[PDB]
Amino acid sequence: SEKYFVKNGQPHFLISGEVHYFRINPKLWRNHLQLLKQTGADTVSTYIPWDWHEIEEDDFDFEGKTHPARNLIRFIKLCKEENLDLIVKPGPYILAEYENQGLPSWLLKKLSKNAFALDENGNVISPDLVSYLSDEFLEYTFKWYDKVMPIISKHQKEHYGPITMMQLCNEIGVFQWLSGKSDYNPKVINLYKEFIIQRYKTIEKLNSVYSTNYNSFDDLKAPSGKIKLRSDYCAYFDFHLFFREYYNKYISILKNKIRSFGINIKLTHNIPGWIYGNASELPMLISTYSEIMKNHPDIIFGLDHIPEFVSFRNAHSDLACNKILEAMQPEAPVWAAQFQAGTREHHVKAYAKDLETFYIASLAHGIKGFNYYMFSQGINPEGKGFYGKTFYFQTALDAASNKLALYDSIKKVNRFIRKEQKDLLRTNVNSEICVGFYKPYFFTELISSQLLKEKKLNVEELGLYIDPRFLREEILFNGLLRGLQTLNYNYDVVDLENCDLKSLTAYKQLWITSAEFMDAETQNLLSEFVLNGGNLILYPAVPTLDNYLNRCEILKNNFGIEFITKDSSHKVSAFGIEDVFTAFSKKQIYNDTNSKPIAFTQENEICGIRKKIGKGELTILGFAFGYTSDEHLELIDKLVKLNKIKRELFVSDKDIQFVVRENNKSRYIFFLNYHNERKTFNYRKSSEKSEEISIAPFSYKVIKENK
Amino acid sequence: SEKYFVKNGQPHFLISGEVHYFRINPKLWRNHLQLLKQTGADTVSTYIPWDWHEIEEDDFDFEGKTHPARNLIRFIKLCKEENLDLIVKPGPYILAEYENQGLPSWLLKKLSKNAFALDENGNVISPDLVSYLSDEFLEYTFKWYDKVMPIISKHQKEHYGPITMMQLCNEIGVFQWLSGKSDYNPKVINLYKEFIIQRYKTIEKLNSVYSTNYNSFDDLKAPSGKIKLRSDYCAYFDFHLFFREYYNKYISILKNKIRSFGINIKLTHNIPGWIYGNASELPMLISTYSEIMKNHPDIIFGLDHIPEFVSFRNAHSDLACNKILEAMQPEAPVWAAQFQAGTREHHVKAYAKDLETFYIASLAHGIKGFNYYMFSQGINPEGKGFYGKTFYFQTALDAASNKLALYDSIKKVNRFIRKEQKDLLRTNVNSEICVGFYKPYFFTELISSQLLKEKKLNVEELGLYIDPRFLREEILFNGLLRGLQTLNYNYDVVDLENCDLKSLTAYKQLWITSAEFMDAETQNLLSEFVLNGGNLILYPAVPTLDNYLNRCEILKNNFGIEFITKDSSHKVSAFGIEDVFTAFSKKQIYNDTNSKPIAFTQENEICGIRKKIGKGELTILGFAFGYTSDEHLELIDKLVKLNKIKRELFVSDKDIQFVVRENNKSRYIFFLNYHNERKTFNYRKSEEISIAPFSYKVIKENKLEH
Ligand SMILES: OC[C@H]1O[C@@H](O[C@@H]2[C@@H](O)[C@H](O)[C@@H](CO)O[C@H]2O)[C@H](O)[C@@H](O)[C@@H]1O
Ligand SMILES: [Ca+2]
Ligand SMILES: [Ca+2]
Ligand SMILES: [Ca+2]
Ligand SMILES: [Ca+2]
């Protein structure tokens, strides 16, 4: 059952608003807090910028002695007086469109070149981009923590202060992503060499996996440049594995330091990945936290949602992100550390009537808490803005604390949440579909991404044809997940790593989007799933290689599949649907042994089959489709109906999205119109005269039923 | 002064709908045409696919002998019976999501390897991609023309047929754009060599310009791979010039063959470039047609507008494109050969209420005619779709001629246009701002584009810091042009090539977005402009190089400018605006003798000046800004107000966009709400109105005689 925040042994919907004390006239701090409280928010959230408080090396001001807005201590006391809990975020990085991402100018001037993140040629990637594990960086970070952490410790909830949560640093790795370049600092390269020796033990074992001919570990260099050989792909794959251990070591060092101050509050981190109003790359960024989330059950990750608009063009991003966070972090609530309010960019408008729908859609899509970012506009003091004087536009409050149009939208959404939170937080959706999350397909931020400058991964040079980024973006994120949401079929996402078979068994169908490679553990898990009675849908490929592109045919043999890869027209027929456009000329052509052929190439060769195996069912399609045609939705619909899965409602307009959330007491129907059309429609429960609804463009309705 | 289509000696708003007979049940051809006519549309437009009609080599069906939807003759007859003019588009390429882009399968099977576009290794780029000047391709094209062109000729309006216009081929060069790959067919490379020999005359002259080390023209190889040296940049620059001449040679061969059949109707071509609902790349595609537009005053280019949605996210794209086409094609009306109706992509919705506002915005932004693409949905016959069974979604009519939501929107907009066309077509905007179009910055489709994944141009490798695509997309298209439209300042665009000094004197300001390179002819033109009394705004660089990156400091010397390039904070102050975020660390720091400093680095070095030169005024900014902050709109506004330029209206809500269009007698005020907010505002000349989200209002004002 559901994960949710709890206050006083009852479900609590975390409603926070971001208010930057350092960007607001301190004579107006109280008015901002009062107006936030009056929306029904229970929490306020702020960065504590290292640059703002360590005004010169070893010169600290938290009391407003050198600038009134340096009076952190007073802001904390005002939070307590106005009955708001406080989330504090002291960095060292805050980003936050603050000069030098929040690092002091004096620090970046003073640090040696080996404090910085370095490219393949030894050059500084960016004058504000440190190497996370630089000894110099960590020494200064610790001296900053020595001053700000005693203040945070004294003002924690357990000492009757307002502070309930603290974020460690900010969006770890967001610059290795954005800058479009990875850190070849020698501290990093030496840690990588240690990681490889620990992983492989002998150069002979490494040479056997990579198919390389090194005489010693001293001959192994950090991979750089384009992947041309499978041995380059192997080296980069382990480099990805290493960076996940690297970020875990960084956050582990910050956490150990923080705990030494008697800070026992909840620790948080925040997930980047939205850009241009979609989040198809966020799954790659959350995959960079795989080792933190396994090692730190006490650090809760939240999402940084930046939709910019709310339409069918991005409707699927927030649900797919909320589902993937749940998959990687199943023991904590799904929540947004930064939940768009106003816009960071003047030229990229944020309409109250878009964001209001986003807020309701987020509830439909399972969000359990959020921090409106930004609730309050700021004015950068003293030239501190990265890109201009004003921080955010079209917020709930302007910097002067005037109510703007979003204020009433947030009050309306908060009112509904506070009325309903006791039941709403306990509601589930009935998912009969599970979609597999295979993390290794996402481990490409060094070699293949939307932000990366040079494409380093070209699978055709490795004798492959299914690119893992193309598969996870277009076949999974924009394809299957977009398709299921559009068709109003509930799905859950499961992390396949150390996945318990007992968790998969509750679903009517398990859907796996597969490349030509998949590890032995996952091939074995899916084999057992089907033999024991599971129903598996697998496309576009039966894998035949492992994560190092060495032979592994476990699943192919356990399923009694024979296939050859042949070129044909992109168009196939599947389940009687003609002219299904597929992504590749190459297809898997299956022997029809003990199977029903259900998809055919233009030469009528078999490119999909259905089989019974043990107590289970297998459907394999040897071709790739996402959602770029109507035939693709017809095909997803056909596949779902193979196990007689039904939608919760009959709705007369197929372009209306709904979510039914229920517990024992209560049912919530969320209707979402992601289209620029006033829609009049009727619906009824699949279970047992119809109700008529009119919905405005880009709008929502919520119906509560008492059961 | 305005350019517009004419019918019966009066202004005529060309309203066409695209209806693909080859994709529609012939029993329903008359129904589609009657419903199109009933919207007030006057013209219908279609491809005539070569693959569809030459069913096997030298076997032609135009009469539905082998499939009823091959009855082209009957469709043409129906157009006439239903009182519609017809636009025909017989290729040879049609694209149109048709298998093999409209070329016959039997042709692609039969052609020799030397008929195909080849990569630098001599490998076929794509089995459906021919070399445009292949002898074998033009031979088979001519044999297609020998059968379809006598039918088109017989059905011209001249012979009380319906045919009024014909498109030659389709988006010439589009495949080099989409792939980032040039045709290295030896026949193309031979024509390139001839182009280079013709241009430079001797290997010594080419070596002096390129700084190459060739002993003869025999050493010369077509450029390929990344640009590492200034000499590679030179070679690639001329390779782009060559492709513009090559496309002109191709369309000239088609044109002359067409004219040989007594076809005297108006000839057209079409311009692509919209990507994900914005058009910042479309100017690059306009630039590929520079030589066609110079040499064929009688071929009318129309735009392929694909906005997908209508909001502030893309509001500036259509105006910037319409203005640039006007600059390049001043003697023809700006029109949309493909004007979005429905969506090519099922997952990319096209809402009737969005497109209705796009159609009215298009009128505000000077469009004189359009062809709804697609008015009618199609079903691909017997697997001949590139993609699935269906061609377009959310159209005016489905393939079965069912009316869809867009139908009533088109009928409403068409009623307005017909009511107003006689006056509306003769209106212009009063532009006091002129923005220079310098085509060489756009000549990059083989080395730097939004569609080219692996960038071949990296200007830092050449000792430069201002990339021409960054300049033209972010500083010009999404920056200055977006800013002026947002601020409701009218602008015009002028082609700086062979530009008449007398045309520039009409304007109060000329804005030049300059890289470190600019040819001598443009440097001299801008020198004379200011010296004779013009007011020039120039940023982010005084250029010091020509198009071949050789020294050329004519403008710098004529204006008494001296500068050092120095690194500083991205933020500057300009005209007392603090914290103006600029694109580059590197800025020009100007000597201020005989000058007024008006912009400063964080350390107070002078990165902008104003000065008097002869009778005119110069404003130089040594930094790059587009529109990514409110300070950028503040800076554009202050720059415009240096020469006392005023908006036509005071409108109380700054986020309402307006366009005042007038002639001697008539004024139209177009109000455009690109925002998801009901807005109430008032207006007066330099009075109270409510506009729905993503909507519009048009007010008419009669002008009083004096
Ligand atoms: O949309 C891409 C990502 O953008 C980040 O915003 C950064 C901002 O944090 C930073 O202060 C400025 C200046 O360096 O650059 C922006 O691009 C967001 O934090 C991410 O959530 C987002 O995915
Ligand atoms: Ca001090
Ligand atoms: Ca030389
Ligand atoms: Ca005009
Ligand atoms: Ca001077």
- Closest chain A residue to the Cα of B355, Cα to Cα: A676
Question: What domain count does chain A have?
Answer: 3
- Measured distance CA(B323)–CA(B5) in Å, rounded: 18
User: Are A374 and A476 part of one and the same domain?
Assistant: no
Pairing state between β A266-271 and A163-167: parallel
Task: Please report, as a single letter, which amino acid is at residue B549.
Answer: L
Pairing state between β A666-673 and A699-706: antiparallel
CB–CB of A676 and B313 under 8 A? no
User: Are B634 and B653 part of one and the same domain?
Assistant: no
- Measured distance CA(B348)–CA(B336) in Å, rounded: 21
User: Are A368 and A472 part of one and the same domain?
Assistant: no
Cβ atoms of A302 and A348 closer than 8 Å: no
Q: Residue A82 belongs to a domain with what CATH number?
A: 3.20.20.80
Could you tell me which residues are beta bridge partners of residue B248?
A: none
Tokens representing residue B517 in the block: 């390179």
For the CA of A304, the closest atom of ligand 1 is 21
Does residue B309 sit at the A interface (CB-CB below 8 Å)?
Answer: yes
Has residue B209 been placed in a domain? no
Q: Which of A51, A95, A348, A391 to mutate to test the pocket of ligand 1 (most atoms within 8 A of CB)?
A: A95
Cβ atoms of B626 and B475 closer than 8 Å: yes
Distance from CA of B233 to the nearest CA of A (A): 20
Q: How many CB atoms lie within 10 A of CB B219?
A: 11
- Measured distance CA(A53)–CA(A58) in Å, rounded: 10
Q: Residue A564 belongs to a domain with what CATH number?
A: 3.40.50.880
CB–CB of A347 and B482 under 8 A? yes
Question: At what angle are helices A72-81 and A135-154 packed, to 10 degrees?
Answer: 40
- Measured distance CA(A329)–CA(A495) in Å, rounded: 9
Q: State the Cα angle at A679 between A673 and A681, rounded to 5°.
A: 105
- Closest chain A residue to the Cα of B573, Cα to Cα: A388
State in Å: Cα A61 to ligand 2 middle.
8
Which residues lie closer than 8 Å to B75 by C-beta, 6 or more apart?
Answer: B21, B26, B29, B46
**Where is the domain boundary, A424, A451, A479?**
A424
User: Are B11 and B148 part of one and the same domain?
Assistant: yes
Choose the closest CB to A388 out of B388, B579, B693.
B579
Does residue B576 sit at the A interface (CB-CB below 8 Å)?
Answer: no
Q: Which of A285, A306, A449 to mutate to test the pocket of ligand 1 (most atoms within 8 A of CB)?
A: A306
Which residues lie closer than 8 Å to B71 by C-beta, 6 or more apart?
Answer: B21, B26, B62, B63, B64
Helix (H, G, I), strand (E, B) or coil at A127: coil
For the CA of A276, the closest atom of ligand 1 is 1
Whole-angstrom CA distances from A360 to A312, B287, B454 are: 15, 47, 41
Burial of B588 (C-beta count, 10 Å sphere; 0-12/13-18/19+)? buried
Residue B179 main-chain phi, psi, to 5 deg: -95, -25
| Length of chain A as a residue count | 707
User: Are B631 and B674 part of one and the same domain?
Assistant: no
Most distant CA pair in chain B: distance in Å? 82
Integer-rounded Cα Rg, in Å, for chain B is 26
CB–CB of A349 and B675 under 8 A? yes
CB–CB of B579 and A347 under 8 A? no
Has residue A240 been placed in a domain? no
Select from A345, A339, A374, A376 the least CA-distant residue to A360.
Answer: A339
Cβ atoms of A131 and A93 closer than 8 Å: no
Tokens representing residue B692 in the block: 């729905």
Helix (H, G, I), strand (E, B) or coil at A436: strand
Contacts of B65-69 spanning 24+ positions with Cβ under 8 A: B67/B381, B68/B26, B69/B21, B69/B22, B69/B23, B69/B24, B69/B25, B69/B26, B69/B381
- Measured distance CA(A500)–CA(A478) in Å, rounded: 27
**Where is the domain boundary, A391, A424, A457?**
A424
Has residue B205 been placed in a domain? no
For the CA of A170, the closest atom of ligand 1 is 19
- Measured distance CA(B392)–CA(A630) in Å, rounded: 11
User: Are A637 and A697 part of one and the same domain?
Assistant: no
Tokens representing residue A37 in the block: 């409280």
Has residue A183 been placed in a domain? no
User: Are B593 and B661 part of one and the same domain?
Assistant: no
User: Are B599 and B560 part of one and the same domain?
Assistant: yes
Select from B445, B452, B440, B457 the least CA-distant residue to B243.
Answer: B445
Torsion of CA B32, B33, B34, B35, to 10 degrees: 50
Whole-angstrom CA distances from A77 to A74, A86, A154, A180, A395 are: 5, 10, 12, 42, 24
Has residue A120 been placed in a domain? no
| Length of chain B as a residue count | 706
User: Are B401 and B448 part of one and the same domain?
Assistant: no
Q: Is the dihedral of CA B81, B85, B91, B95 positive or negative?
A: negative
Has residue A198 been placed in a domain? no
User: Are B364 and B259 part of one and the same domain?
Assistant: yes
Whole-angstrom CA distances from A430 to A434, A479, A646 are: 11, 21, 11
CB–CB of B352 and A675 under 8 A? no
Cβ atoms of B625 and B655 closer than 8 Å: no
**Number of helices (H) and strands (E), helices first, in chain A?**
20, 31
Tokens representing residue A235 in the block: 């080296």
User: Are A437 and A411 part of one and the same domain?
Assistant: no
Which residues lie closer than 8 Å to A541 by C-beta, 6 or more apart?
Answer: A466, A514, A515, A516, A588, A622
Breaks in chain B (C–N > 2.5 Å) following residue:
686
Domain extent, residue B37, equals 6-188+238-424
Query: Which residue reads 């009855």 in tokens?
Result: B71
Q: Residue A656 belongs to a domain with what CATH number?
A: 2.60.40
- Measured distance CA(B327)–CA(A189) in Å, rounded: 55
Tokens representing residue A390 in the block: 């004003």
Q: Is the dihedral of CA B356, B357, B362, B368 positive or negative?
A: positive
Has residue B136 been placed in a domain? yes
Q: State the Cα angle at B470 between B572 and B489, rounded to 5°.
A: 70
**Where is the domain boundary, A390, A424, A458?**
A424
Could you tell me which residues are beta bridge partners of residue B179?
A: none
What was the experiment behind these coordinates?
Answer: X-ray
User: Are A35 and A70 part of one and the same domain?
Assistant: yes
Could you tell me which residues are beta bridge partners of residue B651?
A: B683
Has residue A212 been placed in a domain? no
